[PDB]
């Protein structure tokens with residue numbers, strides 16, 4: 460019922476969040492584990508390229524449901 | 533250069549749609565069963581001499597997300613209908629998925645492949661005859677796969693691409 464969309468280079472993933480006060484760090488780790496093999500990766504919001512979303516910040520603090528899985532530099 | 537084929541994996545929850553997709557994409561099996569909502573993967577593969585890019589869509593087996601079904605069944609070119617050989621009713625749910633595809637696509641002629649997953653399991657509820665006879669009724673190939681041993685995984689996706697080559 461509560462999911463975020465992670466846009467990657469070779470597809471996208473809908474990641475369900477149990478509660479809306481999750482880290483941006485926990486979301487990133489689940490994103491890399493599903494998109495790629497395991498475990499140099501950052502989240503940016505799709506609307507604004509190169510935001511480098513704060514990993515401490517929660518989803519309530521975020522004003523978006525869509526983020527991009529992009530590699531560092 | 534590359535022909536693009538858009539594949540959709542449909543079936544009841546827990547039949548192994550994610551396990552089959554993950555096996556062909558990143559080449560390993562996992563027993564976590566992290567339930568799916570929707571995931572897309574693009575992989576470059578060689579099929580019988582033809583280099584092609586595969587657009588794989590992993591759907592949710594839980595009818596709670598059935599709303600998205602009306603939207604993705606209109607996008608893909610072929611459908612990989614998966615049931616569990618140890619789950620009778622997921623095999624029964626195959627008929628529902630086909631009929632929904634046929635009338636979202638508004639076409640009887642839709643490229644598809646029947647997949648019976650989890651070959652490695654010792655106890656079986658659905659015999660090969662039941663799926664084979666159902667396959668001829670639908671006029672589509674039936675492939676038995678095991679995501680845990682990777683048996684039939686490529687075979688099933690490859691046959692779907694071959695079926696999509698209907699003119």
Ligand SMILES: Nc1nc2c(ncn2[C@@H]2O[C@H](COP(=O)(O)OP(=O)(O)NP(=O)(O)O)[C@@H](O)[C@H]2O)c(=O)[nH]1
Nearest residue numbers: 545546547548549550551563568593650678679680
């Ligand atoms: N022994 C065995 N277990 C399998 C096989 N394929 C999948 N499983 C197991 O079956 C369970 C469900 O697999 P999964 O791919 O997540 O199923 P799904 O069809 O994607 N489920 P959902 O639609 O709800 O997301 C997992 O525990 C997985 O390890 C297989 O070939 N053999």
Ligand SMILES: [Mg+2]
Nearest residue numbers: 549550567568
């Ligand atoms: Mg799944």
